[model samples]
Target: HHHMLHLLEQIRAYCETCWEWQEAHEDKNPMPAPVEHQICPAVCVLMKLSFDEEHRHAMNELGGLQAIAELLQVDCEMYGLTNDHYSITLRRYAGMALTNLTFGDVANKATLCSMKGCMRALVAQLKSESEDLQQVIASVLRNLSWRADVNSKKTLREVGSVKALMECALEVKKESTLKSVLSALWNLSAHCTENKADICAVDGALAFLVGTLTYRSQTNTLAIIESGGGILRNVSSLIATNEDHRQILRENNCLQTLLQHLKSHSLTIVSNACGTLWNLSARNPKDQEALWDMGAVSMLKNLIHSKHKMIAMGSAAALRNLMANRPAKYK
Candidate 1:
């Protein structure tokens, strides 16, 4: 009765077989014509047009998500693109289709992440020759990381996403790229405090973010203050436990920069700023004093409200750290 049920399933099988066949011929010079370029990406492209929530659910059941995810694992060594050649067309569609699927629904993103080699494939696509292609992968990764679960986040870090994202951060003057990578980091580090070391290892990725923040307000083109501040919060949490790292924050004048944004109208910015301050004051009495001297306590006191749990908790935490160094003033 259900004729279309078998259609997607057959297509899934066909694409898988074709992909496997192509892999076996990796040694053939010039890559033995085009199996992937002409077929599977178009398959994804066509399916992606109807990629609504229900359609996505159907695809998930047909093993289509896995098929598309598999298509993303294109071996660059085995396949080199030509100007007129469709070498990366497969990745183009596969990445975009996956982006479509993972755009929201945490489960969809989780499904994609569960596929073996999925994260690695997306990370590999970061260096694609085409910005559009890179954008495809970047958007997909950003979506996948958005409010990701603890296990998904751990897998992203395990797949070396921090380094790849750091590289994306270095790419010059592209709004979507910067926003995607930074936003991805915001989610990636949202709970995994350990990523701070990985990020700092990449030539102090913090400076890159600080530079972006300096330019965030002045221009609408590359806005990432919210996301950038988010990562700094996580990084500063890690720094809070270490004096040397906290000192680095001071050296970059990062603390002062954070202070200036204390009054930011954006809730995200204010929350992140408070988190950074809380962490930076960890075990380091001087930072607590410095934050107090900077008037952070009063500012935080003003922001603490019951409506916003994070803002309230972060404000209370910052004040506690700052006041820890002093006797409670008897009112």
Candidate 2:
């Protein structure tokens, strides 16, 4: 079967390397190939290895599943492979591997920690570069973010510390590489929303997302707008527990920003803006009233009648969530 052959290939690759090193001279140093050279090509091999359904079955038969988690750790560090090629490959496989490893015992914490650390390092690399690396880094961060609750002792809260993440976002925004900047904002908003962290409370990041939405060009406009909208949506969700936080979000004109984004550009932006408005409305009766005062309901109704299905879907959901939880003022 193909599974048996793939497993055999993996074993052969490992054993061949081990045997070569064992029989080699003791006096001479054996330097491994640069990660880019070895890791870049190996990514393809791993991809093929991973997709082999028969190979997955054979892995269990040959105890290869145990080796998979270990291999992911080793592979994750080769981010330098082919100037980001390997990092992309690693991100996809790492996500898949982590999902599988979740079924393992608590002892898998070490492996999960290793994966998180690799993602953090890659984030640093992407931050240093001002290119298309943003999309890649965002994908990787999103994967790691989803694993926030995986390891009790080494949660993302511990390894990918929010303070450090915010610092990275600030740096990226300053770089002004639009795509990377937007990606950073998206990642920050998602994290702040899911974790209820105050990282976005940093003045610089908050100002940049909001200010950029108004000032950036059309080509660069939508991402900044959507990300800013996401921040408001996320922050609104968290404002329920703290009055000061609610005031901060409101004082920043977050409600106004959402309405503007909803009415402004393409349907996607409209959809996201409407979704954020719904979040603000659902936070509480006071917040809902504030949103209505900001004219969120009428703006949403307009979007529902738009030609874009996404816009219509987003508007419908927002209206449902908003009206389902009536504000005291409404009653």
Candidate 3:
């Protein structure tokens, strides 16, 4: 009496048949309107069913993830060539379904990545003209890249996810889309050391992040601010070893803005700013002296006295790191 599983199986079967029909007729005609009209309803149902972990695992075991991946493959192939409503709707449904399947379970995420053309097609959709599609696809990638698995991050990087995501961040206008994209970049770069400099190397990447941090803070969205700061923290952590990336951060005035972030009334913002500063100043002598001269020391000292333990501890840690590179003349 696996009623839901049976329902999902039927949906998956119909979705596959729709994909097959489209592939068969590709040479004779573009994906016709009627085909998308039929396919999307099935995919929409698939997206709904994937919300349950039981149904999600069932779908994964039944080749349903592959079915969604193939749908993305087809979507990317004709992504910009047509902006039809049915096609975009179909893409959204497929993208959301993929996101749900891979949301947290490493097993499901791994299965989806192992599929042919899945990552390639997935990243390709980052360039979709539709903002809604961009948001969905970015979240899909964010979900897939959540694992600490090196191979997972490596595969995504090899597919140029960093470059595509940076481009998307610059072009995206919706605050919601920007938020999702930043979170994806955060997950991609976390524990993946190479991704740190890769983010810095992208044209305008540092500038865009600093700008986003400033504007997002104006609107007071703590989550986006933290994501931007988290990235800055990751990129700056490389300063102890990498000078070129450090120079990029300097050119972007990252430290100066971070010092500004330190003064925010919000403890989370202050904590993140401290974390970034802690990473930036750790083992880096020149930044220590510069931050001291810019009065970062005084602000951090104030934070150290705050009542909240997290803020106080982070401030203390940051203060300690900042002093590591103190000039000998003072001593």
Candidate 4:
């Protein structure tokens, strides 16, 4: 921390002297000082190093967060990296710095969120052509989105971070990229209520996610199913209350994607699936009709005999929900 502060002072000092020398020299064969080139890259080194709470508090105390936030506005082209096929921006470095700073505790994130316009600066990077930059930005947003304050939630929506995240979820294909996208979106859906509909928007994000759930290797993929179920849990909850939100989930055929997981080998998969259904039809007749109309009747009855008390309890709740309207004499 002591050295980090020292480094920062040197950075500002060099910058100030360079500009001062250039001003004093005027047009008398004055040498153009590449002041920014000499100093800004050092911040990226701060990003790559590990920081404990003391370090985080130190950074926050010494205007480090604001400086990093300010650097977020700089792009790769600003530093003559445009000619190269591979170069990261100073903005990406600061983003990476913020990502490291914001994880673990909400206070660290709080310090970041308290910084003016930091969230918007972070969100703008969501449109980057570089997947690596997007990954880090997504991660930082994911961490920050966990803050439960109204301002945190509002900031996410105002900056259109959901749409930016939606684009990432829709475009990414690699295993690593998919992992980051799903994790980020899951965090967003859980943390931000305003993002729910957009998560399952007409762009077909539900079916798109169904592919991601099954996209994992047969064995390693079950953990992926937990978050996939989490996404469903959020969307399905809203469908039971709001017609507009439900319309999107129903039109997307979101319910069909959930039934196969009724007997999933993992308890988390089963819990999230059942929890999703519990939210979907918690005394809502429209959701009940939709489920029965879609053949969830047989699905629920089968779970009635399951050995797992967890699945049995949810299935019974769903059963009461689905069969409440009454149609007798069919037997």
Candidate 5:
């Protein structure tokens, strides 16, 4: 209790120091040196304290991982910090703590359930905030979406609830808040592979995401393009039973857009886009031919010879995925 209180006091002081520095530096022409000095030290101290082994042990002793999580959430609310900061901080802390909590043990039902609730509440809080908060929230959501457990998948579904969360996400679309909209779309796409039943039912959600690719900022357009690719990649797994949806995606020119992104300078975008195409192509030879018709082969070949390692790796992965089912044609 004493250590927890001490740490809280330190964090509070650090936050105050940051605010004071911001206030003092607000109108400075070049920002005076002395006033700017406080910002770095404050940030360094906060980062250092948050990760201090002894401090973490103290927090653990106070009331275990959940107790510390609750305290952090309360502190964030008390400070009225912007959603971006709060979500980012919570993500880092929660992710690290959860890792430690589940390190050696097979996570039981109760632990998974608690983790799910925590993730849902965090996502819900993030959705309630402005579009500016999307980057941090999206990062956290992406992390949670990738956990390979049934309960983890279930938790992703709850946080990514088609009805509740998608409706909230659409609000960003209405404001023409392209960045947040793309972030939300990407978050949804990340979960699609793990929780298809929940994702496929959201009315027009996939269509809406695909439509945004044609508009939005260049960065957001690129992000949605990659996200659309992820969706196709996941849906490809259901092709035998989901021919109709597969046809819909192909008709939408999603493959074409992904091919274009594959030729992009941005390696991350190219990798994801190509990866999606590869997944879709692997479903059948006809789909592989469609990708060839769409010019995927040439684009991927170019990527393979690119200067960037990531692009090369992504290109290799795409080729590998395609080769898995259509070796003769893909080669």
Candidate 6:
């Protein structure tokens, strides 16, 4: 145990000193290759060590988190200067290291949020042309925002990551990259109004989200569908209260696409789809009537008896909203 800590201490000291040197020489054209080469091994080793929970916690405590951020910043700063292999490798490994450290680790996420310039550098990486790099960074953002409280969620929103991610959703063609991007947006939009507004404000945002609800390819896994559904569920939370949001939902044919997801075999998928539909019709008869005409009445009648309580309750709520403010004949 002492040996591991001692080794980590050495690595931390090395990384910190190299980061200082790297920052000082940042203005130099063709900065020292030897210094750049030296830090990659240490970061690569950190990426390996982070796989173990004990080492991850130790690394974070020993300033590994801040060191990793500085390394990312260094790579980001040097991105335009050179397109060499070493630069790409360092950026990828540094991202992987951060991903491992923050994976399901709440304290690490909080530390990253608290660290100045840490989130900014990570968000800035969204501009990279490399899909693999985009995937890793999106995964990191997803992990950070998942189960995050309101304050931290707002912090992420304030950094403009939401707008950037929405743009990613529209631009990224790779399914895996798109999945992670949607996953992060899903986490960020969860119960945060400003984020929901930001996500919805993006041009073509609603159409893109509704489009994901349908099959894009045979390879479309349930994960992306769930993430897409989740963003809709959150965005729809505004539909009941905001006329503009309701109008957008109606215009996007959200009800029809969601009805398609409601037919999913996965109970979790069905449950989330139910939540979105319920939100769409919350006190809004136009959406309610549209869902009714789309055969939601019969669909929900059967769903009310679902084995899952959330599904059963959600269908019941949706059914009530569907019949509300309508003639008795519609019921």
> Which candidate number would show the highest TM-score if scored against the true structure?
6
- How high is each candidate's TM-score? 0.80, 0.51, 0.79, 0.72, 0.52, 0.84
Runs in model 1 lying further than 4 Å from the true structure: 1-32, 35-37, 40-44, 47-58, 74-77, 80-85, 147-151, 217-223, 326-331
* Model 4 RMSD in angstroms: 5.5
lDDT of 6 at 70: 66
After superposition, the stretches of candidate 5 with alpha carbons farther than 4 Å from their true spots are 1-120, 123-140, 146-151, 158-167, 174-194, 212-228, 239-241, 282-292, 301-331
Per-residue lDDT tens digits for candidate 6, residues 221-291, read 68877888888887877656778767776787778877876788888679888888778777766777788
Task: Find the candidate with the highest lDDT and give its number.
Answer: 6
Q: Rate the local accuracy (lDDT) of all candidates.
A: 0.68, 0.52, 0.75, 0.65, 0.51, 0.76
Candidate 3 lDDT at 123 equals 79
Q: How accurate is candidate 2 locally (lDDT)?
A: 0.52
Off by over 4 Å in 3: 1-37, 51-63, 78-83, 217-220, 239-253, 263-271, 282-286, 301-318, 321-331
Q: Where does the lowest 10-residue lDDT sum fall in candidate 4?
A: 77-86
Which ranges of candidate 4 are over 4 A from the true structure? 10-36, 39-41, 51-63, 74-89, 191-193, 217-223, 239-257, 265-267, 279-316, 325-330
Model 2: residues with Cα > 4 Å off, grouped in runs:
1-117, 126-158, 161-165, 173-178, 184-194, 201-204, 218-221, 282-294, 303-331
Number of the candidate with higher TM-score, 5 or 6: 6
Which sequence of candidate numbers ranks them by lDDT, best first? 6, 3, 1, 4, 2, 5
Residues forming the 10-long window of minimal summed lDDT in candidate 2: 98-107
lDDT for position 190 in model 2: 56
Clashes of 1: 0
**Candidate 1: pairs in clash:** none
Candidate 6 regions exceeding 4 Å error are 1-35, 52-61, 77-85, 217-220, 240-252, 306-309, 327-331
Question: Is 4 or 6 the stronger prediction by lDDT?
Answer: 6
TM-score of 4: 0.72
